[PDB]
């Protein structure tokens, strides 16, 4: 199937208490592999996956030097934006940047990304064509014109199609045991009485990879979306994910209800029933 590499950067200003905080995280699909924390002692890009630990000093020094340049650009960027929005110096503000690439099942370039946020709102984003910008507001127009005139998008298209795809492919190859695996969900059901005439039926999906999953409940094969309590897919902490879906069932109607589990790890989707 398809794969992706994503880098997420968060810069938070700290008025009256030193330099802004800067965190970089890198992911390959749903697995994190690198980190940089401006508040940590190391001052280096660090491994967060076992398959990148043995990359070597040339990889490590280079990622450290580049991520250090990212911190300085954002440090300046915070000053620029506070100016653009006519804001006070005593307020804490947030700049977020995300970039990466999506490859198909054929392992070649499919989609590119490079976008910014300011205080949780979209600031600027590179469009799908990788040649044009989307400036969400009036203040963002200066950046949009500054980058259009400097032909910034051309340089961004070169990284997203080349280096990003090349390195995504190399990490997919090196971390083959974990990234190319498909852990199908381990399923179970629970039954608890709400009252004397009702009961909750909870459908569990555990220890699965990747995170993408569909959990649905049907009464006689008919849709029960509006009556299913559904939790956000959550990380187990061991590299796998969890999800549950629950319906309130009138006692004695347990046999009408079926839970359906859709996941890449299942050749055929599972149909579960309380019996």
């Amino acid at each position: 199937g398809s794969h992706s590499m994503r880098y997420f950067f968060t810069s938070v200003s700290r008025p009256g208490r030193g330099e802004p905080r800067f965190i970089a995280v890198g992911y390959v699909d749903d697995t994190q592999f690198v980190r940089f924390d401006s508040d940590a002692a190391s001052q280096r890009m660090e491994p967060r996956a076992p398959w990148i630990e043995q990359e070597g000093p040339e990889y490590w020094d280079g990622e450290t030097r580049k991520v250090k340049a990212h911190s300085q650009t954002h440090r300046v960027d915070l000053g620029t934006l506070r100016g653009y929005y006519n804001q006070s110096e005593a307020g804490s503000h947030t700049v977020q940047r995300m970039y990466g690439c999506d490859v198909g099942s054929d392992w070649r370039f499919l989609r590119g990304y490079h976008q910014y946020a300011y205080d949780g709102k979209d600031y600027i984003a590179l469009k799908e064509d990788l040649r044009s910008w989307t400036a969400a507001d009036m203040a963002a127009q200066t950046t949009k014109h500054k980058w259009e005139a400097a032909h910034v998008a051309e340089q961004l298209r070169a990284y997203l199609e080349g280096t990003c795809v090349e390195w995504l492919r190399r990490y997919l190859e090196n971390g083959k045991e974990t990234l190319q695996r498909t852990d199908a969900p381990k399923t179970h059901m629970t039954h608890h009485a709400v009252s004397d005439h009702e009961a909750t039926l909870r459908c569990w999906a555990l220890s699965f990879y990747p995170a993408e999953i569909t959990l649905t409940w049907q009464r006689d094969g008919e849709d029960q979306t509006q009556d299913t309590e559904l939790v956000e897919t959550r990380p187990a902490g061991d590299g796998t994910f969890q999800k549950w879906a629950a319906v309130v069932v009138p006692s004695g109607q347990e046999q009408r209800y079926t839970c359906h589990v859709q996941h890449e790890g299942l050749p055929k989707p599972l149909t579960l029933r309380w019996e």
Binding site: M45, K66, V67, A69, T73, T80, L81, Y123
Partner: peptide, 9 residues
């Protein structure tokens, strides 16, 4: 691998 580039808002 992260980008080299370096551009300002």
């Amino acid at each position: 691998k992260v980008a080299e580039l370096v551009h300002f808002l």
